[PDB]
Design a protein around this ligand. Structure first.
Ligand code: CL
Ligand code: MG
Length: 225
């Protein structure tokens, strides 16, 4: 009875944020700056979605070295590093995600990504974790700077839904974070949340289901109601 499923990427398809943190810190070292993001600081910075936006936020207050390149160039270098780290093959899909996507495809349900991450990151994740280019898994990919305002703005979900051509009442989102939940709900979507390391402390008021694992969905019927 669902016609589309819209997936968040980071923390939803896979636990990626520690790898992102590594890519940031390695990039900073390679750039010769003293910046270093520990887990405590990264958990705070994660409330700003988008890598460029997160760098900009850090730069507004930090007292270490000035940026030696434009943010966009720092971000490009960090993206390249993340893509390379992803290809090492150590990241797995979260439990339940592969089974849901296979069931959805058997049922003819269309699939989207709706993410704040840059597009090359989606592609790298799909190559490593699904063994296909992203466009063979997802019918619609809404990512990165495709919209002006990132999650918690619903705009990326509104884009995905327009491209899917499915009304929100007939779709559902899977998310891991409060910013993501808010974005989905603003787009009129029911939203299933399963948190992870960096989001477990958050409160998820209005999530339609709150699960310890996507393996607890119980199939496509678990998306209904
Ligand atoms: Cl990013
Ligand atoms: Mg996420």
């Amino acid at each position: 009875m669902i016609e589309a499923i819209l997936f968040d990427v980071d923390g939803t398809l896979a636990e990626t944020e520690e790898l992102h943190r590594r890519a940031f810190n390695e990039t900073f070292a390679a750039l010769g700056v003293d910046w270093f993001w520990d887990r405590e600081e990264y958990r705070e910075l994660l409330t700003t979605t988008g890598g460029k936006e997160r760098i900009a936020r850090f730069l507004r207050h930090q007292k270490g070295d000035p940026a030696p390149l434009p943010i966009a160039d720092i971000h490009r270098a960090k993206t390249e590093r993340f893509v390379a780290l992803m290809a090492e093959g150590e990241i797995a899909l979260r439990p339940g995600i592969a089974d849901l996507i296979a069931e959805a495809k058997r049922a003819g349900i269309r699939l989207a990504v709706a993410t704040t991450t840059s597009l090359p990151n989606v592609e790298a994740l799909c190559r490593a974790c699904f063994g296909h280019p992203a466009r063979e898994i997802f019918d619609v990919i809404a990512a990165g700077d495709m919209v002006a305002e990132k999650k918690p703005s619903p705009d990326i979900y509104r884009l995905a839904l327009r491209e899917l051509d499915v009304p929100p009442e007939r779709a559902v989102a899977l998310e891991d974070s409060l910013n993501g939940l808010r974005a989905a709900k603003g787009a009129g979507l029911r939203c299933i949340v399963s948190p992870g390391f960096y989001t477990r402390h958050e409160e998820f008021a209005g999530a339609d289901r709150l699960l310890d694992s996507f393996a607890e969905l119980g199939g496509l019927a678990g998306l209904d109601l």
